[PDB]
Amino acid sequence: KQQNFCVVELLPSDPEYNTVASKFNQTCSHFRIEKIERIQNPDLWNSYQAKKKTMDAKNGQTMNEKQLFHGTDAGSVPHVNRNGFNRGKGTYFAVNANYSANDTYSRPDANGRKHVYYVRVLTGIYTHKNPQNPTDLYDTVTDNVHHPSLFVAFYDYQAYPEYLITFRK
Amino acid sequence: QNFCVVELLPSDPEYNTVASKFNQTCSHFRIEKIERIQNPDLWNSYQAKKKTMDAKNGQTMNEKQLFHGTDAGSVPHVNRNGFNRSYAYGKGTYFAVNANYSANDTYSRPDANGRKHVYYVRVLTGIYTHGNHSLIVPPSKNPLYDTVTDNVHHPSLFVAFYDYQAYPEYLITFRK
């Protein structure tokens, strides 16, 4: 599985577009969206979904998945499109787009453009598990359990980079 | 102008054709992957401009495969748009006969992980002349040329000024 990918542009006339634009614009209405792309990566998607089938069957009534934001520099984009966020070693995801929208994470490129993904993450059972069963770990960690602003994933195929929002100041 | 990026296997005949050409001047580097870029609209727009050109320049071989180094940031932009507008022998996109020119750190600028990127590009060089810094557009053949170059009888580079004049066919990712 060498996880090739395709990049389709979401058009304003797509029902998926309002939803991503809305969620993004909750915190980032002062940026202007240049475009939104759907990242299509079959091997990566299947691998993500396999982790989820498992995770759904193990965590009972827990809703394992959330859609979160991750900002990154323009040069990491092909790497994320192909390999996701694969490879104690964590990748950060924001609940709100403004956080990911920071220059430290979404480094503005030569044309001024910034890149934040709208990401499907398997947050599962998280804390800020069992002494009797020490090989049993939390799926993610957060900054605050009752009112989270971020999540940290560690394992492979735990997140799919479904949408890429390109924008500027 | 959506696109796909297919990674080639070293087993692939294509992979070796591209690797051979790159290694002629750049064998001292380590190739990590060679991907093929599939952008149907851009490819179409290129083949149209080529149909026009092969019908214009008689016996001329209009097409050359040249190299182009760039930073990791530009890769998604090139994949989608080509070498289009937003990108001392004229104000266009420069392309090299030999990989090692493109492999210069100022063009194929090393990323965070030390990875360099060089396209192997189909370019419609067509009929070309010697170029100059105040160009912006090709000279007229008589008081219009397709590209310009540094030296007309032994060219080492080429400069294109229009869109759809080149297709970013392969991407070569490598390191020192």
Ligand SMILES: C[C@H](c1ccc(Nc2nc3c(C(N)=O)cc(F)cc3s2)cc1)N(C)C
């Ligand atoms: C670029 C990459 C890297 C980049 C950033 C970080 N740190 C962090 N990133 C984030 C993001 C975000 N959208 O990126 C969002 C957050 F709410 C918190 C953090 S902490 C850690 C690693 N590095 C592995 C090279």
Ligand SMILES: C[C@H](c1ccc(Nc2nc3c(C(N)=O)cc(F)cc3s2)cc1)N(C)C
């Ligand atoms: C780094 C990259 C960039 C791309 C092109 C240039 N200008 C120039 N590039 C080249 C290249 C080449 N392989 O790209 C090859 C040459 F024989 C001459 C020039 S001049 C300068 C920077 N990016 C900023 C667009």
